[PDB]
Design a protein around this ligand. Structure first.
Ligand SMILES: C[C@@H](CSc1nnc2[nH]cnn12)c1ccccc1
Length: 167
């Protein structure tokens, strides 16, 4: 039993809700919240910009030191950093950004990072401003992640379409 509430169960291990991931994190304080990161951990907009704002920019400060020490992530890769006031940990995962021409096959590799964590609160990778089809992202999520994932979808219209079209 865990504290995630109001989710629709899609599969054995994947759950979905129309929710603002920021507000969901602040309420649940999950062990792991997933950030829709880029390789530079520049958290400007989309999910990343919203998460970082909720930490009063502490996520960005921590991220800049991480990059100064380690260099950029790989597309499809991840790193674990602090969850600040939102979660114990933040798993920063880089899905491919279609508006940069990145190979969409890298989406499966990106979701594989989730399997290193037993339970996660997450957005749909590569959705939103990353330009991929969120229906496809949900399919890859279901077919790749074996651990327990609670997906927060900000847009109600999209949420209803994702549920109604789910196979
Ligand atoms: C408006 C955007 C969804 S914005 C959103 N909702 N949840 C999340 N997570 C990350 N971005 N995001 C959209 C709708 C329908 C087709 C494509 C794109």
């Amino acid at each position: 039993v865990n504290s995630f509430s109001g989710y629709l169960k899609l599969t054995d291990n994947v759950y979905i809700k129309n929710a603002d991931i920021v507000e969901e994190a602040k309420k649940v304080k999950p062990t792991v919240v997933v950030n829709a990161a880029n390789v530079y951990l520049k958290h400007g907009g989309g999910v990343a910009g919203a998460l970082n704002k909720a930490t009063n920019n502490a996520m960005q400060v921590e991220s800049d030191d991480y990059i100064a020490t380690n260099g950029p992530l790989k597309v499809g890769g991840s790193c674990v950093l602090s969850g600040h006031n939102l979660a114990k940990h933040c798993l920063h995962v880089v899905g491919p950004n279609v508006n940069k021409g990145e190979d969409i096959q890298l989406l499966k590799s990106a979701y594989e990072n989730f399997n290193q964590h037993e339970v996660l609160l997450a957005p749909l990778l590569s959705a939103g401003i990353f330009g991929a089809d969120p229906i496809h992202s949900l399919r890859v999520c279901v077919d790749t992640v074996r651990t327990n994932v609670y997906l927060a979808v900000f847009d109600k219209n999209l949420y209803d379409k994702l549920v109604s079209s789910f196979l």
